Symmetry: C3
Subunit: 334 residues, 3 copies
């Protein structure tokens, strides 16, 4: 059974095929690839774009999305094995995935880390459990990685430069400020796809404490060696932005401070200057800027940057619809 948990699990040929189908769907949006089929969108956290794009995607392909929010409308789920379920959880994922598998053709899952302990969050328990027990394909709608965002992002870049081959371009993945520590998911994903695409990637962040989990630094390394691009970690803003072709911003809390954010708060506040403004963007090679959204203006990026013709954030957001339809079409087959 083939799932869409991470682009890293797919071959370059398969990913290129997904991106091409995405481009095709963008030209002809209505289809019958999901005629009479259905997808269960399981959200453990908030969403606007994700719920909307998947729901519309299913509709445009003749299918139907059922939106579920455990703990909200659906019942809370247990993932640990062998435990005595006498707590808050009402049913086990083993039953949840099997039942849904009798109803729907696809299951999408969004579940952010709990932020109590990265040791457990990095295990991707919810996602892996769905994939394990589900008799139908599972799609990652964002957990500790955000593969759908990777392809929406990649497609937007290919559309911007007018070519699928992004090798040679200087890609800057920069950390940005936010009054709170966030998931590293989008950052992990950006690093993964930018390298897989063979670009010269620079992970710009304040201190070594903000470097991403080794798992992804390693995927990136393997990606570079096989793509022809390069990987580099930087802590100097100006040297990073210099001659960049793409600037992708994202904020996240330092992994070393998981479950103990009290002390990291004063640490992030000292770098609220990492904000992407006209000044920094002026250092790039007429580079494009984007963010996965939602974005806090004048905090992560300035109004001027967000409104510049170089900002492709809206295009990337739109592409979520097309890339997800490509993913759902690829996973079904009945």
């Amino acid at each position: 059974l083939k799932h869409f948990l991470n682009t890293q699990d797919w071959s370059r040929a398969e990913l290129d095929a997904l991106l091409t189908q995405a481009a095709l769907f963008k030209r002809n949006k209505l289809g019958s690839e999901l005629k009479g089929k259905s997808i269960a969108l399981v959200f453990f956290n908030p969403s606007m774009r994700t719920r909307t794009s998947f729901e519309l995607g299913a509709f445009q392909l003749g299918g139907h999305a059922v939106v579920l929010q455990p703990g909200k409308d659906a019942w809370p789920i247990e993932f640990n094995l062998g435990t005595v379920m006498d707590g808050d959880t009402e049913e086990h994922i083993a039953e949840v995935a099997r039942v849904l598998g009798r109803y729907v053709d696809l299951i999408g899952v969004r579940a952010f880390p709990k932020f109590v302990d990265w040791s457990k969050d990095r295990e991707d328990q919810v996602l892996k459990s769905f994939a394990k027990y589900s008799p139908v394909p599972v799609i990652n709608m964002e957990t500790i990685t955000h593969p759908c965002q990777e392809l929406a992002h990649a497609l937007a870049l290919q559309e911007h430069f007018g070519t699928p081959d992004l090798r040679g371009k200087k890609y800057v993945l920069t950390w940005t400020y936010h009054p709170k520590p966030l998931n590293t998911a989008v950052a992990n994903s950006a690093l993964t796809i930018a390298t897989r695409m063979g670009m010269d990637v620079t992970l710009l962040c304040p201190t070594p404490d903000y470097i991403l989990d080794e798992r992804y630094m390693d995927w990136a390394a393997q990606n570079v060696a096989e793509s022809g691009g390069s990987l580099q970690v930087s802590h100097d803003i100006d040297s990073a932005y210099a001659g960049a072709d793409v600037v992708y911003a994202k904020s996240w809390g330092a992994l070393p401070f998981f479950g103990n954010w009290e002390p990291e708060k004063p640490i992030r506040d000292q770098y609220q200057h990492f904000i992407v403004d006209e000044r920094k963007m002026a250092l790039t090679n007429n580079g494009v800027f984007s963010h996965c959204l939602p974005l806090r203006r004048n905090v992560k990026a300035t109004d001027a940057v967000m409104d510049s013709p170089n900002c492709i954030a809206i295009d990337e957001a739109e592409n979520r619809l097309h890339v997800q339809k490509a993913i759902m079409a690829a996973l079904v087959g009945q």
Copy 2:
């Protein structure tokens, strides 16, 4: 770009065309006017009829509605310009409207005032912001006016009297009791459409403190002068109801007490006799009664009035479906 923010922005010919299309949809409910199209229903407040009628309307015309509730499932939105988004809001309407505009063909918005300060609530910031940033038509699902209710109401009246021309009929818009101060939206709308339709309108309320915002009193005046009807404010129940052809009730808090309801509470409680009962209705010319719903029985209207053959509230509620389908059909064109 044409939106449906208020009936006052539309010409009488356009409104008559909407009402006629509504009547046509009521005769033939299934159609293809929205085939493959979609509408994003953004609810900032509660709804049963509105969400249901729009959702079914989209379905019956071959389209699909995506229901969104910011702060609930979607992310909280910022509307003020240039501010440093370091508060509760996660993203700006500029991004929200632009992204939705890449997904859907129409955007409906429901956002009640905050009731903290009428000076800001009367600016209709949420609605206006959607219309400003959205690349697709925006529909008012109730903010400080309720235009969809106006047309549902108007159609019901035309169906009751068996004619589109309501000129000559005596229309009584009466305030009614409610343990809490409410939005003036429906009242503002009732006054607007009743005058636009050329009826002899009487705004019956307890004291001059319950008179509606000048904006609407003025729209009404302009409407009367151009329709041939009349406008009058009254504080005497019996003189108002006398010879009335239509009685539309609605409760609302005194604008002069916005943000300071503590003292107005004892004021409204002294007029809990404004309730629409058989006695008052017996003073009318075999007049019809209606309320926009939801209605608290034995508080706003008595069980006897609600169950009388003269009450057309259920018909008006039904018409919300037909009028909204007419509105969505008029706004799309692709």
Copy 3:
């Protein structure tokens, strides 16, 4: 007007016809029985399977389900007659049912008891009120009985034994532990359908305090006398399980302790051994086991029992989809 409030209101012929149509829908899932039609799914409590199965059912038959949650997205409803609505409730069921009746073709309702006083909960006020005021068929999605579960359960049993005639089989409806007192709905329903099907039923529970409401004990008696099966109450585990063909577990709070659960808590805790394990199941005649779900593993049933080839819980859960489509098809006719 025909509703689906309880299987007990239907003749055996009608129920057999429903089960047969369910079997037919399971073979050919897509149809046009609900083409252009719609159902309003009103949930006063949580749901995953129910909302999903009904929503998908409507979709597969060419219709559309509108999901509503009063107090959540829709407005809170009043059911008592003649009262002065100056409390929390915003509108009366009389208006709610009539309005929905102008929009949809079917109305499903899920409303659990309040657990404050069984005298009032057993009156089934919400369900009965919808049926009373609705101009369209009403479907019980679980209140104090769970008829849709009965048919899903019955069909699964018929599929297991390869025959619609379950007469002769030994059926054991056993109480099971749960850290909290639950609704007796599923138990009441299991007892009702097992007897209606003519099986030899044994109501196994800890003490006479856990015996179900007389209403259902009596339905069961009437059912046995007319079906050829039998009814028996037991408090001894081993004697009950012995030679059983079917074991259906469900936990519920003692009716005599409604509104006063403080003292029953220590009572249930003394019987946490009623858990369905391999030991008890080994006492049966190669019997099948099932639960309505959601189920707390190692509390209501052991992991070994839930994973045994004899557990048909997933099949029963799947059947909810097919039986409900049969029910909706039977109730519509336009």
